[model samples]
Target chain A: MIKKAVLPVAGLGTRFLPASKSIPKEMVTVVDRPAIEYVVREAVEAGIEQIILVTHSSKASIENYFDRNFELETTLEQKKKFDLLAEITQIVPEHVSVISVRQPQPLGLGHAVLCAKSVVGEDDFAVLLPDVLVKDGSGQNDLSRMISRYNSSQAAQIMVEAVPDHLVDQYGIVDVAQSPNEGESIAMQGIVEKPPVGAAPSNLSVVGRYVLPAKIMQLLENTPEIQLTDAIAMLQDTDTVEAYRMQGQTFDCGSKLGYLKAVLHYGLEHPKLGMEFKQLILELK
Target chain B: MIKKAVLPVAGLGTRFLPASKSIPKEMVTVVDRPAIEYVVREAVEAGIEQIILVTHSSKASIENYFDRNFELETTLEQKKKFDLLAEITQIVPEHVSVISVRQPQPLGLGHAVLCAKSVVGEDDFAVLLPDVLVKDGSGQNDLSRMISRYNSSQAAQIMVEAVPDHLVDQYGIVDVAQSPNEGESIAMQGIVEKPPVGAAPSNLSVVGRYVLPAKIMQLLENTPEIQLTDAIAMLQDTDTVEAYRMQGQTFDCGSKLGYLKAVLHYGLEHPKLGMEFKQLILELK
Candidate 1:
């Protein structure tokens, strides 16, 4: 079982501009919940017991969001406001421990994840990018199922999605030996990041979720340019790196269109406002 | 005194695009609260008894935001969750009655306001554009102060602000009779909607809040090119139209930058997250 998870949240969310100017992009809400909380819930549900957040000093608000608010709890308690108390108390589960490490620079995602090296020392860990939200309602969770695949194979796994051919150049493309059976995880020969148009190996794009061994951390530390994809490619030379086709849809919330897509999906399925929002969507159409 | 408020929310929020594609822009959340709720609170605080929302079929979600949710309430009640219950119940005060009228077409602001004639029949009423949010922390409420001006003069009043000379052409500039004494409402000779750069009468721009008599509704009904500014201009022939300088900052939530500005302002002043958010802003600087 993957008992620890690493979340890199040090990136400046310039895409969201003024909203992200005061708040971290991960703290932006989708429906009634923040985007980061969804990622946390995904990890906790996948049986991850420890969380290592790679963040920066400007992201103290994100840390404070996960920590307990004693004053707020006391005020709600005195006012007999148990409903809001229950909603907030569920923000972070008691079973999972959380720790934050600072990445002093905004170099890249690979650099941000390396900041958690000390905390994740000598352990196989899961890395979940807070910006990519995967929704699989009415089905098994994407991460939990990926964890199951990793348990059986015990190989380095990267979640891959079959995106359109034209958009392959925008993502890290996985080079596979041959097509696997439908909905099957396949071993990759190598991975390339942001290949030029028409130069990508395949349309199988590497997504944000990953399950890597502790040895890869050493590779990350020794690499010159220091990219997670580069480390994975280097590991592919010595060991097997498999690509697991994700079962559900993935929204890259770092972009404007992707964020709105998540909002519409979550808003329509919300427990309280779902039916009304559904009606609104239908009426507007 | 203006006891009832007419809120025109019929315009499609094209600027917000994909986010507003499914949800009405008025229902968009700023921090924890919706943008329209802030406008409603302003009216409720100004001693308004009834609220008439001029909306469209595409905006039923806006109406639902104010309506009671029995299933949600019962679910929380059965689960013994009172905190969320309190938050939901406090969304609208019991004293303020809400009514909705449909503007069947995507007309301009004046045509939308004309749709509320029967409901606002034969009495003095206030008009609050749901998109504008005014914040007055240490000063008097903008609508309440405008109401005070309206009571003393017993004339139609439009809230105005002293914008910069360069930006004067972008707004409806109020042509005032010379300069009035400081901090006083003055009679406007005319109003120009988006005049050319150098041709603007004054830097005082008419904002979203309005106090109009029932007679203006009749003029709105008969006028060919029905704009409130034009109706006020027509009324200038027989009645007085005064410009009351608003004391607070007005955020046009219809625009992207304005929406984010309100989000930052409200997020920083929020009860649970203010200090932490302020600290984050300071750290970023």
Candidate 2:
């Protein structure tokens, strides 16, 4: 089982200018909570026993967030405020540990993941980009389903989503030998990063979450430079990288419009928050 | 001179219930940034060397906020999207220190201040309540004025605002000897926590922010808590608690309407946001 999850929050989201400029893009709220909180919750559900966050000095908030603040917890206990404290302290399993490594530079995603090599060790681990929040319909998060497949098949895999063929150029498309006839998982033969529009394979594009063997971390280390070109080149050497079709809609909180959409969507869906938020939104509109 | 400021965030903030249930009230935002961030900026402006936060576990996020988020920061830097980061980073002085002490109980405000005694030691420290945002036509933060007062008189003092006579009962009112004028610093003969509607000796009310002689910490330790009739009984025992009438408008962000007003007021004043916001407000009516 992939026990550790590495989240590369090194990408400065230029698209979501004003909001992400001061706050980490991952810290941007999809609804009431920051986007990264959802990703951490997803990881916890996916059986990730340890979270090795490859952050930089700017993400100190993220580190202190996942750690236990028992004093606050106790005050909440006194106030009988369980619901508020649960949003955070609930994510970490009693046994799970989180270690943070600082990536001092604005290195590419590949380089950020490479920073976690020492912490991840030799076993296969999961790399889940916090930008993509994946909660499953069956209450199992996307990564957990991917881990189930990983344990059975032991393949280095990535999650993909069904996009229209015309929009495939925006994502890394997967060339699969056979599509999944029944369940949520699919097997892909190859993957291409940001293929030209209409030149892409299937609409199943590689989503941000990936479960890779520790060997890939080694591969990431040896790669001279990290860029779209280098990442594609590195992927070209690994057939073990397969694509699993995920079902939930991915909210791109990295963009302004995407952030608003995610906010409205989650605001209209959360049990306690939804109705009031939708009423306020609808009233305003 | 003591340049470090201490912010006490140990309150349950029960007035805002569900929202404050999980998060510290200081985390509530006025214009995108949380209340503590603004107070921190004000402290920075006053040449605060470090920020000491006397808080509970629920407020750990506030500490995380001041710490470095290298990954998030690097991403924003690489993208050259410098607005939010620039605003947040400015409040955190490179030389300024941030330390947190956990206050586990809902003791009175005096207890909260006492918790920071050891960290504060014997320096004439400044205390800024994040809930109260004070601004002046001269653009001086009220705390800055208190520091200036401390430099000249060295008397332990608290910032007070001249509320209209009708509203005097809503806050702790100072019964003082006659002042030459409104802006003059005056001697306090007694402190009335919250007077009956017409019984107020003066309209000047404490609006939260104090420069203390490092001895009040000991005073609070000696003061015993008894179920008081009102806030007046809550503070009657302190000997050196004199009030300085500040030349600024103070917003009580602790109340919902106060918070909303603060948000709208600052939101409209924001340079890039001002015009559109004023237009939006115009359309509101």
Candidate 3:
């Protein structure tokens, strides 16, 4: 079972531009809470107790957000506003162990993940990209479901989403040996990142989540260009790797358009904010 | 001239509940920016300098939001993200001064305004309630219009809106000696705070923005409940006081419903997020 999760949030989110200029793009709010909070909550709900954030020094606010805020706690206590206080005080559960490993350079995603080798040790772990927001309406979380897939197959599982054939060149397309099982996953045979328009294998594009074997850390170190996709592609030759088609709406929040879509979709889903926001959005010209 | 402005953000935003637990209610975001930013930007646009925040110790985030952030500035510089760096680094203009005075207690709005007396000294100033957000349709700001009204009459001016007669009791209703000018703003005769239903002098209710004589600070010091309305009422007896009927939308963000409305209104008005958000909002079921 995957007992730990690695979340890489070190990238300077130029896509979010000015808002991300002062704060990490991961810290940008969805509705009432920061985007990172949603990812953290998703990880904890999957029963992953150890979280390693591959971060940079410029993103100190991200660290401060998850840590204890004594002054704020004291103020809320004195005011007797226990409800709001309770919401903030328990953001990071006590049982969850959070460790930060700094990625000192603007290396690729694979290098950032490789920086977490010491903490991840020899255990199979989950890798969650902070920029990707997954919303599953069928109840079970995508990460939890991926963990189950990993447990049953004992193989490296990468989340993939079927994209339109016209947009196949925009993503890392995966070639599979067989059809997806129950329209959810496929047996991975080969993959190509941003392949040429008519030269792609299949349109099952790789997403930003993975259940990887412990050896992938060593594989990442040896991989050229330090790309996560490159490392995973190399691992496919020697190990059993499968592609799990996402069961929910997966938003690539690294892009401006994608982030807004996620905000609207999630904001409209918010219980307290949905009705009023929906009314207002419809009223706009 | 209204050269100074006072923003009382000391009130614990209990209405927002969990979201306001760790952060000040004023720090709550409507769409992308905090609600207080809208109010501050309004003040700055109206040519008001030296903003004094009547705040509490617990609401340090409000103060921090306006202060310079070195780490964020340095990171944006290093990354060469100049456009976004410019957006954040200039949140507060060079000409405007931000001074925070501790209210220390949960006093009424009148007491909070009085706390800024030391910095305000004897100059005429504007008092903007961070919770009340006003959007003008004519491209002119409400405060700028009110400042013009104050300049022409040299009287204490307060913003008012015509509410339905049945709902008049929910706000501080204003009585006028004569009809308003250009269907907006009337000469103040008397004012009542939360008047009994059907007993209000007029349908015009006092909104949160105010351009007042410095002497109202002295009046606030001697008032019984320290109600700003009571002080305004007394000021009307000897000096001229007028009501400027607002020609735009004014949202009371103290309520959940109002906050959502503000978010939708502003989100739709946002240059970048507006068009896409409009489509998303319209598509909602």
Candidate 4:
């Protein structure tokens, strides 16, 4: 069973210069909650019991956010603000534990995952980049389905979502005989990072979500490019790395444009904010 | 020289809840930039040369935002993204330097200002609370005028704006024999924070913009409960502190509702966004 997920939250977020200058990119808010919280919720829903944050020294905010705030809880308890109290306490479920491992340098994503080797200990763990938020459509989440596929086939699962044919060159397209349908997984030969416009293998692009076996830890240790994709490619050459087509939508919260859209998309569906936000949108319209 | 401004941004800003959990409230974006950036711009327009941030430990984000980013600058230069580079480097003008002092505990607003005493030494400085974004109408900004009033007469200037008489209890109303008119300054006795509905002194409530003497910093040093008002009220006893009615509008970005409104207001005024935003509003209607 895949009961662990490692989130690489150590990126400098240079793309979002001013905002990320002070706050971690993952800590940026989408509507009501910090964007990182949504990713944690996704990991939890996917049966991840231990959420490991591969963090930096500057990222204590992300760690503290998941931890309980005794003072705030006490204040809320005294005020009888049960609704607000529940929101704060329920940042993560009680069963799942959150742990932090620091990446000492500006090394790549591969180094970040390797930082969590001890906690992940012989377990087939999932990796979800905190910046990309996968919004579950009506039914089950994409990560949950990806975990199930990895379990059935005992193969590494790499989440992919289809982009327009024109935009395929902008993404890492999975090389496959045929494109898999949404919510399905199929074995892929390899991934072509930013293939030429017309020379792309498929319109299915890598979605920054992966379910990997413990062997990748040793593989990452052997290879030092520090790039996770390099290690993923090495794994793909030797073993089956299946591409799992995502059923849900994704928002790249790291980019300024994506964050704006993510806020709007989530704001419109927010439990408490939906009504007023919808009204505000229309009021502007 | 009255060229320095102190922004007290140490408050936890509990009203914004989950959004402010991992992110400093001042770091929350108004539209294209963090809300604190707008306040900094207001100070620049008022001719402030040194910006002091009296910050809490968790609020390093607010301080770092104004500092230079060499790596981002080099990247933008390489890409020839000149316009974007200008936005980042020009966060504050070259003449204005940013200094930060830490507030170790959950002290009151007065204590936050006291933290910046060394940087603000021997000079009267403007204290513009970071959470409130003051939008000037057509001419000079209200802060500039408030400084001018302080310059004309050495009386401490407290920025105030007229709220409705019924809503005065929701604010800190400054009491004067007769309420000053718009953009006018007059001697005020004291401030009544959230007075009873009918007992409100005047509709002119404080707007968190103060043109204070260097004496207030010393006054804040020995003050208790650490509230800034304690010092302000005491300063009013020996010296003159007048209420200056503001000509511009104010938005409380600390609150979620106000944040939403500030976004819309700023979005509507955005040079590239105005036309599209107006169209969006009409289309939604």
How would you encode candidate 3's per-residue C-alpha lDDT over B26-141 as one tens digit per residue?
Answer: 86656666678889989998898888999987666577668776766676787787777777777878989899999877668898999999999999999999999988778788
Q: Of models 1 and 2, which has the larger TM-score?
A: 2
Worst 10 residues of 2 chain A by lDDT: A276-285
Superior candidate under lDDT, 1 versus 3: 3
CAPRI tier for the interface of model 3 = acceptable
**lDDT, candidate 2, B42-100, per-residue tens:** 88888888688889765666776776656556756765767756754655657888888
- Residue pairs clashing in model 1 are A83-B82, A83-B83, A84-B83, A84-B84
Q: Score the docking of each candidate (DockQ).
A: 0.03, 0.08, 0.28, 0.41
What is the fraction of true interface contacts found in candidate 4?
A: 0.43
Better of 3 and 4 by lDDT: 4
lDDT of 4 by residue, B17-98 (tens): 7878767888886555788888888999889988888887777777778876665577568668777677777787777898
User: C-alpha displacement of B220 in model 1, angstroms?
Assistant: 0.9
Off by over 4 Å in 4: A69-86, A221-230, A233-238, B68-90, B104-107, B114-122, B137-139, B164-166, B176-182, B215-240, B267-285
Model 3 alpha-carbon drift over 4 Å, by segment: A55-108, A175-183, A189-191, A221-226, A254-256, B10-12, B22-27, B55-81, B89-94, B97-108, B164-170, B175-183, B189-193, B196-201
lDDT: worst 10-residue window of model 2 chain B: B225-234
Clashing residue pairs found in predicted model 4: A284-B281, A285-B281, A285-B282, A285-B283, A285-B284, A285-B285, B110-B228
Using DockQ, rank the candidates from best to worst.
4, 3, 2, 1
What is the TM-score of candidate 4?
0.87
lDDT per residue for candidate 1 within A78-152, as digits (tens), equals: 668687667766666778888999988666878877888899989989999998998877467878888888888
- Categorize the docking of model 1: incorrect
How do the candidates rank by lDDT, highest first? 4, 3, 1, 2
Q: Is candidate 1 or candidate 3 better by DockQ?
A: 3
